[PDB]
Every structure is written in C-alpha cells, then in structure tokens.
Design an enzyme around this catalytic site. Sequence first.
Site, PDB file in Angstrom:
ATOM      1  N   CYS B   1       0.643  -1.303   0.070  1.00 22.83           N
ATOM      2  CA  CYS B   1       0.024   0.068   0.010  1.00 22.83           C
ATOM      3  C   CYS B   1       0.695   1.393  -0.184  1.00 22.83           C
ATOM      4  O   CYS B   1       1.960   1.301   0.505  1.00 22.83           O
ATOM      5  CB  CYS B   1      -0.956  -0.145   1.232  1.00 22.83           C
ATOM      6  N   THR B   2       0.357   2.405  -0.542  1.00 23.74           N
ATOM      7  CA  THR B   2       0.889   3.579  -0.558  1.00 23.74           C
ATOM      8  C   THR B   2      -0.316   4.657  -0.220  1.00 23.74           C
ATOM      9  O   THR B   2      -1.052   4.757  -0.721  1.00 23.74           O
ATOM     10  CB  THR B   2       1.523   3.853  -1.882  1.00 23.74           C
ATOM     11  N   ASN B 163       4.634   0.348   3.587  1.00 28.87           N
ATOM     12  CA  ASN B 163       4.336  -0.531   4.426  1.00 28.87           C
ATOM     13  C   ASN B 163       5.499  -0.811   5.701  1.00 28.87           C
ATOM     14  O   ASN B 163       5.647  -1.861   6.253  1.00 28.87           O
ATOM     15  CB  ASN B 163       4.035  -2.038   4.079  1.00 28.87           C
TER      16      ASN B 163
END
Lengths: 94, 232
Positions: B1-2, B163
């Site tokens: 995820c970003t 993350n």
Amino acid sequence: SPAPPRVNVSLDAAPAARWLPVLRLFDPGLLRAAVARIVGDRVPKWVRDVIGKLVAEMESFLPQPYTEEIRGISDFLNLSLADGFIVNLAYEAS
Amino acid sequence: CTSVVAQDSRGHIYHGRNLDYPFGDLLRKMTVDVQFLKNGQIAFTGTTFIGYVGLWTGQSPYKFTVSGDERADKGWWWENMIAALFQGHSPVSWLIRTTLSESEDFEASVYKLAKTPLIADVYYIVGGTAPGEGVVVTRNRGGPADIWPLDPLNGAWFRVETNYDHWKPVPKSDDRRTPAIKALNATGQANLSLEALFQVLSVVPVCNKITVYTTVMSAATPDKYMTRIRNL
Ligand SMILES: *[C@@H]1O[C@H](CO)[C@@H](O)[C@H](O)[C@H]1NC(C)=O
Ligand SMILES: *[C@@H]1O[C@H](CO)[C@@H](O)[C@H](O)[C@H]1NC(C)=O
Ligand SMILES: *[C@@H]1O[C@H](CO)[C@@H](O)[C@H](O)[C@H]1NC(C)=O
Ligand SMILES: [Cl-]
Ligand SMILES: [Cl-]
Ligand SMILES: [Cl-]
Ligand SMILES: [Cl-]
Ligand SMILES: [Cl-]
Ligand SMILES: [Cl-]
C-alpha cells in the site's frame, strides 16, 4: 480506470439490514461461493465451527455495530457466521 | 500500500492512497464507494468491498480524511486474537470507521487513531482541512510508536507511507517509497492537486499488478472524493 459504484448505506436502518442494497450489486451467489471456497480451503472445519459458536454466543459483547452487521451479511449470503467473521478479520488473521 | 498526505503552496491538504492486495481479480469487482447516511445527511464516505464492514479509506466532510496501510507485527494466535476482541481491542479497519463516525475534528481523530488499542499493527495516515494538518501515525497494538507530521515551512510538504517504518530503509525487493518521492519531488509543491496526486499514484511500481484501487481526497472539498479501479 473506471470508477466504482457509488451506493448509499443508511445508518438509520437496522445493522443487519443496512448492507442489503449494497449486497445486491455484485452477484451474491457468486460472492457466497467465492467466500465459502476461499475460507474453506485456508481454515479447517473444526476451527470454523468453534469460531461460529463464540461469535453467536458472545454477539452482545463483541464490538458494535460491526458484529450485528456481519450477522446480516452472512444471513443474506447464506454464509456461516464464522465465514462472514473470518473474511471481515482477514487482515488480522495474516 | 501507498498513502500520501501533502500540502500545496496555498495551504490546501491533499490525501491519496493505493490499495494493493492479492486476490485482486475478485476485489476489483467488489470495490464500492459507500456514503454512510445518518439523520438525513452524509455522515462520511468510504471505499470498501462488498461484505466488508470496516474502512481502509474514508472521509469526514470538512473534518478529516483517513487511510490505513499494513504494518508487520509479531506472530498472533487466533486464540489470542479472540481474547483481544473480548479484552476490548479493535480491528484496524473498524477503528477507522468508528473515528469517521464519532470524531469531531482532525486533532480529535488523530488522538483516537493513536491511542485506541488494536489487534494488529497498522499505519494511519490522516489529513485535515487546515495547513500542516497531516500525519503518519505508526501504530502498535498498544499505542503510538511515532507521529510523523507535515512540516511544510521546513520543506516537508508531503509524507509518504508504504508498509515499512519511515525512519528505516525499505527492502530493496519492495521499494515503492523512493519512486513515490521522486514523483512527488518532480511534481512540485506548487503544482500539487488531486489530479497531480493521482498521476503520482499511477507511477510504477507505486501502482503495480496487485493494486486494486486508487483514492484521492480532501476533507475540505468532499465532493471531489474519487476512486479508480486499477488493472481492471
Ligand atoms: C444517495 O443519497 C443522496 C442524498 O442523500 C441522493 O441524492 C442519491 O440519489 C442517493 N444515491 C443512491 C445511489 O442511493
Ligand atoms: C439464500 O437463502 C435464501 C433462503 O434462506 C434464499 O432466498 C436466497 O436466494 C439465498 N441466496 C443465496 C445468495 O444463496
Ligand atoms: C527530493 O527532493 C529533495 C530536494 O528538496 C532532495 O533533497 C531529496 O533527496 C529528493 N528525494 C528523492 C527521492 O529524489
Ligand atoms: Cl448504529
Ligand atoms: Cl494510555
Ligand atoms: Cl506490537
Ligand atoms: Cl515506507
Ligand atoms: Cl522496516
Ligand atoms: Cl483540486
């Protein structure tokens, strides 16, 4: 890149019944089979049966309204309360 | 995820996030933008999947925006997990939705997301409606390990969270932080906007094979909340 469907969810409606307008969007029958298969293959049956009893017996003592909402999703999709509870906690289970 | 929370040259806050998750072939079809209604009004908006009651991306109009990234924790037993549920601990996606439902303003939402005990680790990225209102909250099960705020007057007009902990180097095998900084560096503070941030979140590998959806939002302009399904 298309945009997702935009749907309303009423928090004035009962927790078990407020997600139904959203559940009818995707193919519910395909969603039940996809959930039941993926949870069935990764979680043994005896654990799922225990998870069901705990959640159902201690429904009043688990966080709300999430648990009562998971109860209504699983009832509409004909999933075991353990199946609906495991997918909603799939992040922690990792 | 970003997740990215950033500030332009005028003091406007922008918030964007990518959700990467395996099984995405199925999830992309199940992604919906949900408007939760309360007392005849839009209490908050969130992006979730059909059958999932928590929110990993959400918006409280003219108050705050929140997105959650995954953080690796210690091994957790399913027995210990149920104990944590009954002990009073909360899932990370359920706290996001509770905060969006209860918290009155940005500072109060940061307090709730930082202190409430959790079942697993997570990163909470929160954006507000006033200059400097942006933080990356690195969470343990017990409480906040760190709180990384925006510092625009010193040149830090954006915070990037993937993350991994922001004060440690990322794995060479999964380095999506530096390309997201390069793209934000190249965009520039003055040229920042929701669409410019969407372009940043479309860079590879910030957007990759397992990316499910992209969201950009700003609590101050709640009508511009937009989500896009990727790799569909
Ligand atoms: C959602 O609610 C708004 C007003 O609250 C209404 O204008 C809109 O048509 C609704 N959309 C759906 C898909 O129900
Ligand atoms: C679930 O079972 C009910 C009967 O209890 C039935 O009416 C409904 O069509 C079923 N739906 C699915 C998705 O299996
Ligand atoms: C981003 O730009 C700053 C210049 O203000 C520079 O110091 C930094 O190294 C750059 N980072 C990357 C990853 O390009
Ligand atoms: Cl409620
Ligand atoms: Cl405390
Ligand atoms: Cl920990
Ligand atoms: Cl990172
Ligand atoms: Cl790390
Ligand atoms: Cl804009």
